[PDB]
Amino acid sequence: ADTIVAVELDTYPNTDIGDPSYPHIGIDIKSVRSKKTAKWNMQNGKVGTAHIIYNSVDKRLSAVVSYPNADSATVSYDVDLDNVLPEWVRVGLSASTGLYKETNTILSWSFTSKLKSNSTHETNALHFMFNQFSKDQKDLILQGDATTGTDGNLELTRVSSNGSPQGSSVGRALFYAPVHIWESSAVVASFEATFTFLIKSPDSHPADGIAFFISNIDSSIPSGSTGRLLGLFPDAN
């Protein structure tokens, strides 16, 4: 199947599969069952910010999610990506809804990757920044229900003409070009992704979340990965 690594912003508690009983952010390594989580005071209707960072020196993946003039939620995990991901991967954003829904709007997204090879200051780097998405974003691969264009935002899951989120929806957006994430002799390898999201829900509790992910190049949405599976995993193992 696919090799996935993701930082999820889980809005709905699925205790039946490991989710702590409250909204949270977590780090998933090839499984929707987070290796580590942290409480997250999600705020319906407010624009938030997510910051993911990683460096080959510490081999520690960390994430920060916060809202203006509010507290932050943090989560870290020691992991050696060399032994988890292939050296060439694709990066993207994923989201979904199930019985309950929410809007999974991305207002901006940026990514930076640097690979310092073992040679007198020989760095390879990639950097892209999206502050507004157009109707025809050719440098992005949209999968599932993902669409771009309205208000210049990226709507990961289905939204009605009036603006109401729809249930049972999956969507993903991957940056077109492959990303050289690691190398056998890289003195230092690191990357940092950032994105602002706006999650709104009309019904009671919202679901199911947004996730930043790294996968094999030819990855695609698994069948039935709506709802609790965040469009990332085929099953809950």
Partner: peptide, 10 residues
């Protein structure tokens, strides 16, 4: 801020 579950900053 249309509204939101277990919420509100100050």
């Amino acid at each position: 801020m249309y509204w939101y579950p277990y919420a509100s900053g100050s």
